[PDB]
C-alpha cells in the first residue's frame, strides 16, 4: 500500500525554484545532507545519555557515502535517531512551510541558494542534483518507512520492505543525467573537505 500526498503549496514552489533556477554551485546539497545526518546523530547520542538502551538498535554513530555509477545514485546513510511516519509526512521532521517562505523571501531580497540551510530547509537542495529522492528511515519502536518524491507536487510514503536498517536514515539521490560528477571519488572528497571538515562523526566514502 502506497500513500500519495500533496506538498504544501509553499514547499512545491520552493522545489520548483530549486529545479528551475540557474545556479551553478550545486555541490552545496551534500553539506546540507551531511549536516542533517549530524543533527540526527546528535539527537540519538543525547537521548542515549539517559537511556543507553536506545542504542540497542546500533551503537556506532557514523555517516556513509555510497556512490553507485551503475544505478546513477548517491546514497547518504546515517545511524541517527531516525524518523517516524508522522515525521516523514510532516515535511521530514521540519517546519518547512515557514522556513520555505522566509527563504524564498530572502532570495527576493538578494540572498543566494547556498544560504538555504539557514532557513532549516536544506534538504530540498537535493533537487539541485537529483531527479528523484528516496528517504528510507527507521526510528526506535516504529517501523521502517520509505518516503519518495520526483517533485511535481507530490510525495509517497510506504512501509519499506527492503534491507532492514537498525536505526537511522538513508537518503538515495537518483542523479540527473548531467550531474554524475557527484559519483566520482575525488569530487566527493573535495566537497566533504571543503564544506564538512568539522562534522563530529566519521564519514566513510565507499569506493566501487
Ligand atoms: C531527509 C532529511 C531531512 C534528513 C533527515 C534525517 C533525520 N532523521 O531523523 C531526524 N529527526 C530529527 O529530529 C533530527 C533533527 C534532530 C532527522 C532530521 C529531520 C530534519 C532535519 C532538518 N533540520 C531540522 C530543524 O531545522 C534545521 C534542520 C534534520 C534531521 C537525517 O538523519 C538525514 C536527512 O538528510
Curated annotation (Swiss-Prot):
ATP binds at residues 36, 78, 97, 123. The keyword Repeat does not apply. It is found in: Nucleus; Cytoplasm; Melanosome; Cell membrane. Keywords: Acetylation, ATP-binding, Cell membrane, Chaperone, Cytoplasm, Host-virus interaction, Hydrolase, Membrane, Mitochondrion, Nucleotide-binding, Nucleus, Phosphoprotein, S-nitrosylation, Stress response, Ubl conjugation. One of its GO terms (cellular component) is extracellular exosome. The keyword Cell membrane applies. Residues 1-208 are annotated as: Interaction with NR3C1. ISGylated. The TPR repeat-binding motif mediates interaction with TPR repeat-containing proteins like the co-chaperone STUB1. Homodimer. Identified in NR3C1/GCR steroid receptor-chaperone complexes formed at least by NR3C1, HSP90AA1 and a variety of proteins containing TPR repeats such as FKBP4, FKBP5, PPID, PPP5C or STIP1. Forms a complex containing HSP90AA1, TSC1 and TSC2; TSC1 is required to recruit TCS2 to the complex. The closed form interacts (via the middle domain and TPR repeat-binding motif) with co-chaperone TSC1 (via C-terminus). Interacts with TOM34. Interacts with TERT; the interaction, together with PTGES3, is required for correct assembly and stabilization of the TERT holoenzyme complex. Belongs to the heat shock protein 90 family. This is Heat shock protein HSP 90-alpha. It comes from Homo sapiens. The chain holds residues 16 to 223 of 732 of the full protein.
Amino acid at each position: 500500500e502506497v500513500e500519495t500526498f500533496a506538498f504544501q503549496a509553499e514547499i512545491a514552489q520552493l522545489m520548483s525554484l530549486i529545479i528551475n533556477t540557474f545556479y551553478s554551485n550545486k555541490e552545496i546539497f551534500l553539506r546540507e545532507l551531511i549536516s542533517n545526518s549530524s543533527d540526527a546523530l546528535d539527537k540519538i547520542r543525547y537521548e542515549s545519555l539517559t537511556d543507553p538502551s536506545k542504542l540497542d538498535s546500533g551503537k556506532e554513530l557514523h555517516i556513509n557515502l555510497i556512490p553507485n555509477k551503475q544505478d546513477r545514485t548517491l546514497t547518504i546513510v546515517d545511524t541517527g535517531i531516525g524518523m517516524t511516519k508522522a515525521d516523514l509526512i510532516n515535511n521530514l521532521g521540519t517546519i518547512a512551510k515557514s522556513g520555505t517562505k522566509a527563504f524564498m523571501e530572502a532570495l527576493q531580497a538578494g540572498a543566494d541558494i547556498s544560504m538555504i540551510g539557514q532557513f532549516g530547509v536544506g534538504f530540498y537542495s537535493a533537487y539541485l542534483v537529483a531527479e528523484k529522492v528516496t528517504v528510507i528511515t527507521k526510528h526506535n519502536d516504529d517501523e521502517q518507512y520509505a518516503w519518495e518524491s520526483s517533485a511535481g507536487g507530490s510525495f509517497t510514503v510506504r512501509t519499506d520492505t527492503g534491507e532492514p536498517m537498525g536505526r537511522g536514515t538513508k537518503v538515495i539521490l537518483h542523479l540527473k543525467e548531467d550531474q554524475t560528477e557527484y559519483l566520482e571519488e575525488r569530487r566527493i572528497k573535495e566537497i566533504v573537505k571543503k564544506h564538512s571538515q568539522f562534522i563530529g562523526y566519521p564519514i566513510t566514502l565507499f569506493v566501487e
